[PDB]
Design a protein around this nucleic acid. Structure first.
Ligand SMILES: [Mg+2]
Ligand SMILES: [Mg+2]
Ligand SMILES: [Mg+2]
Ligand SMILES: [Mg+2]
Ligand SMILES: [Mg+2]
Ligand SMILES: [Mg+2]
Ligand SMILES: [Mg+2]
Ligand SMILES: [Mg+2]
Ligand SMILES: [Mg+2]
Ligand SMILES: [Mg+2]
Ligand SMILES: [Mg+2]
Ligand SMILES: [Mg+2]
Ligand SMILES: [Mg+2]
Ligand SMILES: [Mg+2]
Ligand SMILES: [Mg+2]
Ligand SMILES: [Mg+2]
Ligand SMILES: [Mg+2]
Ligand SMILES: [Mg+2]
Ligand SMILES: [Mg+2]
Ligand SMILES: [Mg+2]
Ligand SMILES: [Mg+2]
Ligand SMILES: [Mg+2]
Ligand SMILES: [Mg+2]
Ligand SMILES: [Mg+2]
Ligand SMILES: [Mg+2]
Ligand SMILES: [Mg+2]
Ligand SMILES: [Mg+2]
Ligand SMILES: [Mg+2]
Ligand SMILES: [Mg+2]
Ligand SMILES: [Mg+2]
Ligand SMILES: [Mg+2]
Ligand SMILES: [Mg+2]
Ligand SMILES: [Mg+2]
Ligand SMILES: [Mg+2]
Ligand SMILES: [Mg+2]
Ligand SMILES: [Mg+2]
Ligand SMILES: [Mg+2]
Ligand SMILES: [Mg+2]
Ligand SMILES: [Mg+2]
Ligand SMILES: [Mg+2]
Ligand SMILES: [Mg+2]
Ligand SMILES: [Mg+2]
Ligand SMILES: [Mg+2]
Ligand SMILES: [Mg+2]
Ligand SMILES: [Mg+2]
Ligand SMILES: [Mg+2]
Ligand SMILES: [Mg+2]
Ligand SMILES: [Mg+2]
Ligand SMILES: [Mg+2]
Ligand SMILES: [Mg+2]
Ligand SMILES: [Mg+2]
Ligand SMILES: [Mg+2]
Ligand SMILES: [Mg+2]
Ligand SMILES: [Mg+2]
Ligand SMILES: [Mg+2]
Ligand SMILES: [Mg+2]
Ligand SMILES: [Mg+2]
Ligand SMILES: [Mg+2]
Ligand SMILES: [Mg+2]
Ligand SMILES: [Mg+2]
Ligand SMILES: [Mg+2]
Ligand SMILES: [Mg+2]
Ligand SMILES: [Mg+2]
Ligand SMILES: [Mg+2]
Ligand SMILES: [Mg+2]
Ligand SMILES: [Mg+2]
Ligand SMILES: [Mg+2]
Ligand SMILES: [Mg+2]
Ligand SMILES: [Mg+2]
Ligand SMILES: [Mg+2]
Ligand SMILES: [Mg+2]
Ligand SMILES: [Mg+2]
Ligand SMILES: [Mg+2]
Ligand SMILES: [Mg+2]
Ligand SMILES: [Mg+2]
Ligand SMILES: [Mg+2]
Ligand SMILES: [Mg+2]
Ligand SMILES: [Mg+2]
Ligand SMILES: [Mg+2]
Ligand SMILES: [Mg+2]
Ligand SMILES: [Mg+2]
Ligand SMILES: [Mg+2]
Ligand SMILES: [Mg+2]
Ligand SMILES: [Mg+2]
Ligand SMILES: [Mg+2]
Ligand SMILES: [Mg+2]
Ligand SMILES: [Mg+2]
Ligand SMILES: [Mg+2]
Ligand SMILES: [Mg+2]
Ligand SMILES: [Mg+2]
Ligand SMILES: [Mg+2]
Ligand SMILES: [Mg+2]
Ligand SMILES: [Mg+2]
Ligand SMILES: [Mg+2]
Ligand SMILES: [Mg+2]
Ligand SMILES: [Mg+2]
Ligand SMILES: [Mg+2]
Ligand SMILES: [Mg+2]
Ligand SMILES: [Mg+2]
Ligand SMILES: [Mg+2]
Ligand SMILES: [Mg+2]
Ligand SMILES: [Mg+2]
Ligand SMILES: [Mg+2]
Ligand SMILES: [Mg+2]
Ligand SMILES: [Mg+2]
Ligand SMILES: [Mg+2]
Ligand SMILES: [Mg+2]
Ligand SMILES: [Mg+2]
Ligand SMILES: [Mg+2]
Ligand SMILES: [Mg+2]
Ligand SMILES: [Mg+2]
Ligand SMILES: [Mg+2]
Ligand SMILES: [Mg+2]
Ligand SMILES: [Mg+2]
Ligand SMILES: [Mg+2]
Ligand SMILES: [Mg+2]
Ligand SMILES: [Mg+2]
Ligand SMILES: [Mg+2]
Ligand SMILES: [Mg+2]
Ligand SMILES: [Mg+2]
Ligand SMILES: [Mg+2]
Ligand SMILES: [Mg+2]
Ligand SMILES: [Mg+2]
Ligand SMILES: [Mg+2]
Ligand SMILES: [Mg+2]
Ligand SMILES: [Mg+2]
Ligand SMILES: [Mg+2]
Ligand SMILES: [Mg+2]
Ligand SMILES: [Mg+2]
Ligand SMILES: [Mg+2]
Ligand SMILES: [Mg+2]
Ligand SMILES: [Mg+2]
Ligand SMILES: [Mg+2]
Ligand SMILES: [Mg+2]
Ligand SMILES: [Mg+2]
Ligand SMILES: [Mg+2]
Ligand SMILES: [Mg+2]
Ligand SMILES: [Mg+2]
Ligand SMILES: [Mg+2]
Ligand SMILES: [Mg+2]
Ligand SMILES: [Mg+2]
Ligand SMILES: [Mg+2]
Ligand SMILES: [Mg+2]
Ligand SMILES: [Mg+2]
Ligand SMILES: [Mg+2]
Ligand SMILES: [Mg+2]
Ligand SMILES: [Mg+2]
Ligand SMILES: [Mg+2]
Ligand SMILES: [Mg+2]
Ligand SMILES: [Mg+2]
Ligand SMILES: [Mg+2]
Ligand SMILES: [Mg+2]
Ligand SMILES: [Mg+2]
Ligand SMILES: [Mg+2]
Ligand SMILES: [Mg+2]
Ligand SMILES: [Mg+2]
Ligand SMILES: [Mg+2]
Ligand SMILES: [Mg+2]
Ligand SMILES: [Mg+2]
Ligand SMILES: [Mg+2]
Ligand SMILES: [Mg+2]
Ligand SMILES: [Mg+2]
Ligand SMILES: [Mg+2]
Ligand SMILES: [Mg+2]
Ligand SMILES: [Mg+2]
Ligand SMILES: [Mg+2]
Ligand SMILES: [Mg+2]
Ligand SMILES: [Mg+2]
Ligand SMILES: [Mg+2]
Ligand SMILES: [Mg+2]
Ligand SMILES: [Mg+2]
Ligand SMILES: [Mg+2]
Ligand SMILES: [Mg+2]
Ligand SMILES: [Mg+2]
Ligand SMILES: [Mg+2]
Ligand SMILES: [Mg+2]
Ligand SMILES: [Mg+2]
Ligand SMILES: [Mg+2]
Ligand SMILES: [Mg+2]
Ligand SMILES: [Mg+2]
Ligand SMILES: [Mg+2]
Ligand SMILES: [Mg+2]
Ligand SMILES: [Mg+2]
Ligand SMILES: [Mg+2]
Ligand SMILES: [Mg+2]
Ligand SMILES: [Mg+2]
Ligand SMILES: [Mg+2]
Ligand SMILES: [Mg+2]
Ligand SMILES: [Mg+2]
Ligand SMILES: [Mg+2]
Ligand SMILES: [Mg+2]
Ligand SMILES: [Mg+2]
Ligand SMILES: [Mg+2]
Ligand SMILES: [Mg+2]
Ligand SMILES: [Mg+2]
Ligand SMILES: [Mg+2]
Ligand SMILES: [Mg+2]
Ligand SMILES: [Mg+2]
Ligand SMILES: [Mg+2]
Ligand SMILES: [Mg+2]
Ligand SMILES: [Mg+2]
Ligand SMILES: [Mg+2]
Ligand SMILES: [Mg+2]
Ligand SMILES: [Mg+2]
Ligand SMILES: [Mg+2]
Ligand SMILES: [Mg+2]
Ligand SMILES: [Mg+2]
Ligand SMILES: [Mg+2]
Ligand SMILES: [Mg+2]
Ligand SMILES: [Mg+2]
Ligand SMILES: [Mg+2]
Ligand SMILES: [Mg+2]
Ligand SMILES: [Mg+2]
Ligand SMILES: [Mg+2]
Ligand SMILES: [Mg+2]
Ligand SMILES: [Mg+2]
Ligand SMILES: [Mg+2]
Ligand SMILES: [Mg+2]
Ligand SMILES: [Mg+2]
Ligand SMILES: [Mg+2]
Ligand SMILES: [Mg+2]
Ligand SMILES: [Mg+2]
Ligand SMILES: [Mg+2]
Ligand SMILES: [Mg+2]
Ligand SMILES: [Mg+2]
Ligand SMILES: [Mg+2]
Ligand SMILES: [Mg+2]
Ligand SMILES: [Mg+2]
Ligand SMILES: [Mg+2]
Ligand SMILES: [Mg+2]
Ligand SMILES: [Mg+2]
Lengths: 275, 48
RNA sequence: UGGUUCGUGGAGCCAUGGGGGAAUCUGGGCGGACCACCGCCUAAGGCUAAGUACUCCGGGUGACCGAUAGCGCACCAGUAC
RNA sequence: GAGCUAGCCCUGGCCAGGGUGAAGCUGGGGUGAGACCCAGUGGAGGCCCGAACCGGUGGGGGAUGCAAACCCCUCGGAUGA
RNA sequence: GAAUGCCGGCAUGAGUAACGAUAAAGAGGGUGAGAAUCCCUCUCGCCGUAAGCCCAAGGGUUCCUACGCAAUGGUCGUCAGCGUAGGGUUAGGCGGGACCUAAGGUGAAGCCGAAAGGCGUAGCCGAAGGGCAGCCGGUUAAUAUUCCGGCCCUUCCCGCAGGUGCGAUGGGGGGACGCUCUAGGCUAGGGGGACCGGAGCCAUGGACGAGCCCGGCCAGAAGCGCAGGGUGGGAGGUAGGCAAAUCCGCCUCCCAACAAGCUCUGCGUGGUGGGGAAGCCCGGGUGACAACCCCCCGAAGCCAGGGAGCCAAGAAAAGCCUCUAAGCACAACCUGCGGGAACCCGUACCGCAAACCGACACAGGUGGGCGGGUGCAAGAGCACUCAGGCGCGCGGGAGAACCCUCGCCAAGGAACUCUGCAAGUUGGCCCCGUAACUUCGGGAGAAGGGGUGCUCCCUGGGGUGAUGAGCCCCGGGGAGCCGCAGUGAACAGGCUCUGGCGACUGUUUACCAAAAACACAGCUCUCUGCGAACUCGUAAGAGGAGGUAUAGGGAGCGACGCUUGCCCGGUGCCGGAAGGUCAAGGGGAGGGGUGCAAGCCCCGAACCGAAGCCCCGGUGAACGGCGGCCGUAACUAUAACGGUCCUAAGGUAGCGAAAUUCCUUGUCGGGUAAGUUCCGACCUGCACGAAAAGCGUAACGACCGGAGCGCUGUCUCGGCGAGGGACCCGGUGAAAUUGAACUGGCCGUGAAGAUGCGGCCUACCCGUGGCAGGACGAAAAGACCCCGUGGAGCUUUACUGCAGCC
RNA sequence: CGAUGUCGGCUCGUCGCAUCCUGGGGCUGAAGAAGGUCCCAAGGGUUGGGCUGUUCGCCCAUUAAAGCGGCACGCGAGCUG
RNA sequence: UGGGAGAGGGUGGUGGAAUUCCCGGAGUAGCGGUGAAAUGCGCAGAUACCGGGAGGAACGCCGAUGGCGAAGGCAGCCACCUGGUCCACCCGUGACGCUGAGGCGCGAAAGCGUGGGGAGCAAACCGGAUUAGAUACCCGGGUAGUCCACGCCCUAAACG
RNA sequence: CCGAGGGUAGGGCCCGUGACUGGGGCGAAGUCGUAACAAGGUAGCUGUACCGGAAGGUGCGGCUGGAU
């Protein structure tokens, strides 16, 4: 579900929020939060290196467990499902029988009180971590490591998932959310299921103010600038691009492939993204 | 209306201060010149 | 590539960022591409006074100034501002 | 040189009073259950009126000014980008 | 002798403008050489969510006192934020430091850079954040939470007693948190009292009264009382909290549980210590043995780390508690008590301003707290007023033009004008009542209209009391009174119809543009598989992001509704492992120099040899483009149709004299007495057209057009009045400008627009208030224009490079 | 060109006469009345609105008439903009 | 009460054939298509054959003049949840019935909104032919859509 | 007090009319093509969708009122 508002204001008319019904606890585990140093887009030089950012709501980085093989064979009870402002996805608070508490990206279909486990011997059930070589081919999977013991990298965003399409030696064949077919190492941990909160993409911000809340400052069209600023600058009255459409830095923004060609990871990428 | 001079003793000291000067090759050389000129105060007097 | 008067010129010489890579005098470098001849010199370790440059300071002397001049300042001036 | 100005970061502070009355909740009506309707509750919003505060719409004054951008009247935002 | 030369002096304008908010002054008395300007009294006015009071910045002796007036003060000056001198700032509790961390800064380890240097988890630095022990009164010319007085309290050291496994920079807990709304109970603050205290007053016609006027508190340990906050207890297991652990976390049982308990804070009382008015008398005396109480109102402040809801999900670290570790246990820590110890810096005064930022004692700017009373629905709004502070550092007169600000106006009511610019109108609150359209929220305060004071009579509900009186709150119904007028003064929408543009709230050219521009949710292309792309940097390193394709970058479009056609020849991008061309390099037929020679040196063909371009193809929400002539239908006209040339293909839907229409005020219709505007149509659209989007769209707009109603000094058409100037007198006293001047009209002449030449005409000498035709008036070495082998910003299929990428 | 501010409006005029009106006439295809045309004449007069920035013009309602020009396309140290 | 048949419906699963696409191997001068052709595809190695992978849709034989539903409609297979209906017993209830203006629900395809999915097919569209022209018929391409979930839309030769 | 009515303001229905615009009926002696009736020379009709000078065409599903 995605909550809709009656139009008692101009922007309430299209504004929609999440349903938040999957959420059980409304406070973060103090043991597991750390302050998030906001960057405002600027680097260590003080210079903006990513534009139109800052002024977002104050947020508190919940530490997430992307290793999960950190505790093999040791089970855990899904204690609560919480809101994480630091990501599209929802997080689950795991009470390990070890006593240790941890956060994991909450898969779709998790249950408050259900128990999960990481390990090769682990069952093929929701929210269970295994190396890929022990996961059945065809089974949907999320939060995939890219290399062994380097932490989950792929399929972490809300609703996203990857599907195993077969094996080949030390490596297996994954269909990443993009649709790219890639060889991931068979010894890479992954968590069966798909990321929850799949309704995320169907959220209408509704107003200019909501974008600001998310730390997103207003964007400015190249066309709305002058020649010193943008390639699309100047022009008396409005104007077409008058050149191939380009970035502020001159490089072409329509169709031009920018991935490095001789990148060694090409050997493990089968099919480039589609659509 | 609000003008360009809005005195602040911390800001004055942490900017044109002697310790600010000596920290930077440009600033150290400023002191050299001011000293060479015979200037009575190499760094802006400020009341701490 | 730089240096030399040498701006690729017939372009050697001195220096060297890259690649290849010796020999110990029957060794090697040089005399303006190169080859012979005839000569000159002994690279890949270091040090070395004096003759030379400058004038904060001290002194001597001006066909130099004489308070709008001579130093920005003859005076409590790199000050007042 | 960011003590003006622009943006961002950290940490604080400020916004009288009044108006409108979303979701929800409860009670009732309705149905196989519902949807839904109704009243009461409720107190949402880049919501309304309007001071502080932030502005600078129109007019007049000022024009060796009170002022190297001011003054009078009027007007905009005023829980939010 | 000239350089709008440089430096200085002194002129002109000129006794001219001005003398800095129109809040406002008058008199009496003193001082003194001198008084509108200093002191004192009285009268008058002004602020009173300040123009009062208290903080923090900043300023740095401006503070107090004495003695002074050359200068500073826009006048004066006896006065002063001025000159001379002397004095004045007192803290274990206030602030900061000997505490803590935030961004950031710095930076052992480490990484990088020609040098200078750039980075960098820890550590350290860094505060208006966390932490932390003082309240009330008295006193000085000037300081006080600092001195004094009373009542409290913190830490450190030592000792005593009792207690305990003590012990940490290590572990855990806690500190520890948003926005909005909000409960209960208090306090601050306030109003009333026929009660208490008080010097008094009885005027001018009445009043000796439940009369008037004044005051009726403050702080305070323990204990207690009320209100709240915080917190489960015991046992067993334990593999996690990078050692250890009895702590914490997790599992299980037993009780307890919206309580109680233990603990913390607030408020009340509280032994005691203080304060204590009007009036009167010369800051103090008195009042006064002052009184010191009851009712009501009541916070945004306190209990607080309270509650609820919501999404945008809301610092850290120390203090603190607990766990253990080395160690150590005749030590240590804990608890109570006692004695001793407790350092550095700040403290004056201004502080919405004459002491700060604005060259000025400058109508500007400057963060936090307090900010009383009454009336107006409310409130920090508005009017008056308390406390407190002021009358703004030139005055006195006169009562011209003219200017500013303001008041009113016969008849008319937009005839004004680019435009109702401006000014009227309207105006708060209660009731009645409200259209097209709509996205069903709205439009809507639509429109329009009725009510509004006071007096007496009756009655209803609430809060605090007690369920009653009293108080306070919210009403209802009658019958009456006065005026031109009852939100009787102040504060407080004019309205409606209709088009363009933009959906909207927002943003912008600080100092001539606030818009239709920017932004905006939303749409679509496109890049990016993570050591991401991209951005910054020589690099290291960063940002992206402690994110992972429901993500991140770039571009365009810009809610929403209905849609977005045709052209891939050229350009760009994507795909193409053939082919063609192509540099270094590989190759070495062959040719050359030189030598007696072996040899050295050199040129050098075929052949192999990347990207790139050529080439083949794909691609429009990539750059872009989207024709012409001729013929033809029972009258004419027109052309469904046909013919042909060209093209990469010839504009689809919808819209159209438009933010676009040259001809043009196109034509027709509407509105008007009259309409180059406006609205509705028509289409031979000079020169619309579909994401530089096409066409519409409710709501929205200090946007730009058109119309009407309402009302008006905008106007016919001006009049009068007020105040501040202007004028006159006393005081002070500028400025640009200035070749020198003894500076008239006409008609001519002159470098072609003459005070200055000619001829005439006119004209006694010098001022003052006024008007602006001329001195090609002043100002600025023309912004336009051109010129210079002048300069910059910007563009590109100009040239030539470089970064970057291949 | 070390600056001679520009359309139109407003205000204020003043002048030329190639006269729009009023006054005096000649001719007339002048019966009258009303005109046509030329002559003399500058004394005075020459309205109010709609549209457009407009001058200009068109139009409305009048009028004796609704003249045309010069004065830096008169007049911005007089205003408007 | 005791039975029975059946593509009635809903959900979750799963099985094979074929097409297309991608990789590999082998092979070469054409494949394709039509009334005949051409566009298109093919020495940049197609078609025809073999192995492998991805993916979507529809379920051959059974299959029938059949079955079921009120209609629309419903077909590989398994399970679950679920409706209608027929038979025997003649056991209970004792007219409780038929019909049905309004109302409500369902309702093929095409179409719409949001999101997925896209192999084949295929409005629009492009091209090749035919033609007098061919905005068609035929041919090579090809976008919505065809498929799933959710909400609309409520039409039909919705016919017996 | 009520009150004919008058007045201001705002709604509702009906009628006439209006630049222009849409399609309809009739006219026929016009131009363009030939869609339907035979298998009408691509079987037809139909709901819907898109498209074209026009009749119509094509897609998706449906009916036989389809020749053989
Ligand atoms: Mg709502
Ligand atoms: Mg609304
Ligand atoms: Mg929600
Ligand atoms: Mg929270
Ligand atoms: Mg926290
Ligand atoms: Mg913490
Ligand atoms: Mg840093
Ligand atoms: Mg820095
Ligand atoms: Mg959910
Ligand atoms: Mg989205
Ligand atoms: Mg969307
Ligand atoms: Mg964005
Ligand atoms: Mg933008
Ligand atoms: Mg621009
Ligand atoms: Mg720039
Ligand atoms: Mg550029
Ligand atoms: Mg451009
Ligand atoms: Mg520009
Ligand atoms: Mg432009
Ligand atoms: Mg243009
Ligand atoms: Mg890899
Ligand atoms: Mg300000
Ligand atoms: Mg200055
Ligand atoms: Mg400071
Ligand atoms: Mg400070
Ligand atoms: Mg000195
Ligand atoms: Mg050289
Ligand atoms: Mg040469
Ligand atoms: Mg050379
Ligand atoms: Mg070398
Ligand atoms: Mg030798
Ligand atoms: Mg050598
Ligand atoms: Mg040599
Ligand atoms: Mg030689
Ligand atoms: Mg040697
Ligand atoms: Mg030496
Ligand atoms: Mg010697
Ligand atoms: Mg020497
Ligand atoms: Mg000397
Ligand atoms: Mg001398
Ligand atoms: Mg001198
Ligand atoms: Mg000198
Ligand atoms: Mg001298
Ligand atoms: Mg000098
Ligand atoms: Mg700043
Ligand atoms: Mg305040
Ligand atoms: Mg409020
Ligand atoms: Mg609720
Ligand atoms: Mg509200
Ligand atoms: Mg608002
Ligand atoms: Mg407002
Ligand atoms: Mg203004
Ligand atoms: Mg402005
Ligand atoms: Mg005025
Ligand atoms: Mg000015
Ligand atoms: Mg305002
Ligand atoms: Mg606003
Ligand atoms: Mg905010
Ligand atoms: Mg000078
Ligand atoms: Mg005078
Ligand atoms: Mg004068
Ligand atoms: Mg004068
Ligand atoms: Mg004067
Ligand atoms: Mg003045
Ligand atoms: Mg005034
Ligand atoms: Mg005055
Ligand atoms: Mg007054
Ligand atoms: Mg006297
Ligand atoms: Mg007050
Ligand atoms: Mg003093
Ligand atoms: Mg003093
Ligand atoms: Mg003096
Ligand atoms: Mg004197
Ligand atoms: Mg003196
Ligand atoms: Mg004086
Ligand atoms: Mg002064
Ligand atoms: Mg003094
Ligand atoms: Mg003390
Ligand atoms: Mg302290
Ligand atoms: Mg110490
Ligand atoms: Mg410290
Ligand atoms: Mg550093
Ligand atoms: Mg180091
Ligand atoms: Mg601090
Ligand atoms: Mg303290
Ligand atoms: Mg005191
Ligand atoms: Mg003192
Ligand atoms: Mg103990
Ligand atoms: Mg212990
Ligand atoms: Mg500890
Ligand atoms: Mg309360
Ligand atoms: Mg108290
Ligand atoms: Mg009497
Ligand atoms: Mg009190
Ligand atoms: Mg266990
Ligand atoms: Mg352990
Ligand atoms: Mg234990
Ligand atoms: Mg007390
Ligand atoms: Mg007393
Ligand atoms: Mg006494
Ligand atoms: Mg007595
Ligand atoms: Mg007594
Ligand atoms: Mg109370
Ligand atoms: Mg409040
Ligand atoms: Mg709370
Ligand atoms: Mg620390
Ligand atoms: Mg031990
Ligand atoms: Mg010390
Ligand atoms: Mg003090
Ligand atoms: Mg003070
Ligand atoms: Mg102020
Ligand atoms: Mg203040
Ligand atoms: Mg003050
Ligand atoms: Mg003062
Ligand atoms: Mg000042
Ligand atoms: Mg000063
Ligand atoms: Mg003053
Ligand atoms: Mg001031
Ligand atoms: Mg202020
Ligand atoms: Mg009020
Ligand atoms: Mg106000
Ligand atoms: Mg006020
Ligand atoms: Mg007052
Ligand atoms: Mg004054
Ligand atoms: Mg009047
Ligand atoms: Mg009227
Ligand atoms: Mg007019
Ligand atoms: Mg106005
Ligand atoms: Mg009013
Ligand atoms: Mg209407
Ligand atoms: Mg009204
Ligand atoms: Mg009265
Ligand atoms: Mg109002
Ligand atoms: Mg228009
Ligand atoms: Mg706008
Ligand atoms: Mg706005
Ligand atoms: Mg501006
Ligand atoms: Mg500017
Ligand atoms: Mg601004
Ligand atoms: Mg400026
Ligand atoms: Mg400016
Ligand atoms: Mg505006
Ligand atoms: Mg859109
Ligand atoms: Mg990084
Ligand atoms: Mg990073
Ligand atoms: Mg990160
Ligand atoms: Mg745009
Ligand atoms: Mg093309
Ligand atoms: Mg192309
Ligand atoms: Mg092409
Ligand atoms: Mg093509
Ligand atoms: Mg390419
Ligand atoms: Mg080949
Ligand atoms: Mg040879
Ligand atoms: Mg030879
Ligand atoms: Mg190549
Ligand atoms: Mg297009
Ligand atoms: Mg082109
Ligand atoms: Mg004809
Ligand atoms: Mg068309
Ligand atoms: Mg028109
Ligand atoms: Mg046009
Ligand atoms: Mg033109
Ligand atoms: Mg036109
Ligand atoms: Mg005309
Ligand atoms: Mg008409
Ligand atoms: Mg106009
Ligand atoms: Mg029109
Ligand atoms: Mg036409
Ligand atoms: Mg356009
Ligand atoms: Mg376009
Ligand atoms: Mg439009
Ligand atoms: Mg609509
Ligand atoms: Mg509109
Ligand atoms: Mg506006
Ligand atoms: Mg007037
Ligand atoms: Mg007057
Ligand atoms: Mg006078
Ligand atoms: Mg002449
Ligand atoms: Mg002339
Ligand atoms: Mg002349
Ligand atoms: Mg003369
Ligand atoms: Mg003049
Ligand atoms: Mg004048
Ligand atoms: Mg003259
Ligand atoms: Mg002039
Ligand atoms: Mg001039
Ligand atoms: Mg000037
Ligand atoms: Mg010059
Ligand atoms: Mg010039
Ligand atoms: Mg300019
Ligand atoms: Mg040239
Ligand atoms: Mg030249
Ligand atoms: Mg040049
Ligand atoms: Mg240039
Ligand atoms: Mg770079
Ligand atoms: Mg690139
Ligand atoms: Mg000129
Ligand atoms: Mg004449
Ligand atoms: Mg005759
Ligand atoms: Mg006659
Ligand atoms: Mg006659
Ligand atoms: Mg005559
Ligand atoms: Mg005349
Ligand atoms: Mg005359
Ligand atoms: Mg005349
Ligand atoms: Mg007009
Ligand atoms: Mg006449
Ligand atoms: Mg004339
Ligand atoms: Mg002219
Ligand atoms: Mg003129
Ligand atoms: Mg004229
Ligand atoms: Mg002017
Ligand atoms: Mg003018
Ligand atoms: Mg203007
Ligand atoms: Mg203009
Ligand atoms: Mg069959
Ligand atoms: Mg049947
Ligand atoms: Mg029976
Ligand atoms: Mg029976
Ligand atoms: Mg249907
Ligand atoms: Mg369908
Ligand atoms: Mg075709
Ligand atoms: Mg044709
Ligand atoms: Mg096909
Ligand atoms: Mg049938
Ligand atoms: Mg036919
Ligand atoms: Mg047919
Ligand atoms: Mg047929
Ligand atoms: Mg045609
Ligand atoms: Mg077709």
């Amino acid at each position: 579900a995605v909550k809709k508002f009656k139009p008692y204001t101009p922007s309430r008319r299209f504004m929609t929020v999440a349903d938040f019904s999957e959420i059980t606890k409304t406070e973060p585990e103090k043991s597991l939060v750390k302050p998030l140093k906001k960057t405002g887009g600027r680097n260590n030089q003080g210079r903006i290196t990513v534009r139109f950012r800052g002024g977002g709501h104050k947020r508190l980085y919940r530490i997430i467990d992307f290793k999960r093989w950190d505790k093999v064979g040791i089970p855990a009870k899904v204690a609560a499902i919480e809101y994480d402002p630091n990501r599209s996805a929802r997080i689950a608070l795991l009470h390990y029988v070890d006593g240790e508490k941890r956060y994991i990206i909450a898969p779709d279909g998790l249950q408050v009180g259900q128990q999960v486990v990481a390990g090769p011997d682990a069952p093929i059930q929701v929210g269970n971590a295994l190396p890929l070589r022990f996961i059945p081919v065809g089974t949907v999977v999320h939060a995939v490591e890219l290399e062994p013991k380097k932490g989950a990298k792929l399929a972490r965003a809300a609703g996203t998932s990857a599907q195993i399409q077969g094996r080949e030696g030390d490596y297996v064949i994954l269909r990443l959310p993009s649709g790219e077919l890639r060889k991931v190492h068979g010894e890479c941990y992954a968590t069966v299921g798909a990321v929850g909160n799949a309704d995320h993409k169907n959220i209408v911000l509704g107003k200019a103010g909501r974008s600001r809340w998310l730390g997103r400052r207003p964007h400015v069209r190249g066309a709305a600038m002058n020649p010193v600023d943008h390639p699309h600058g100047g022009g008396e009255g409005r104007a077409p691009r008058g050149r191939p459409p380009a970035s502020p830095w001159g490089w072409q923004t329509k169709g031009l492939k920018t991935r490095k060609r001789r990148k060694p990871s090409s050997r493990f990428i089968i099919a480039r993204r589609k659509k | 209306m609000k003008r360009t001079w809005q005195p602040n003793r911390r800001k004055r000291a942490k900017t044109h201060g002697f310790r600010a000067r000596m920290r930077t090759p440009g600033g150290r050389k400023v002191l050299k010149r001011r000293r060479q000129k015979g200037r009575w105060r190499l760094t802006p007097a400020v009341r701490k």
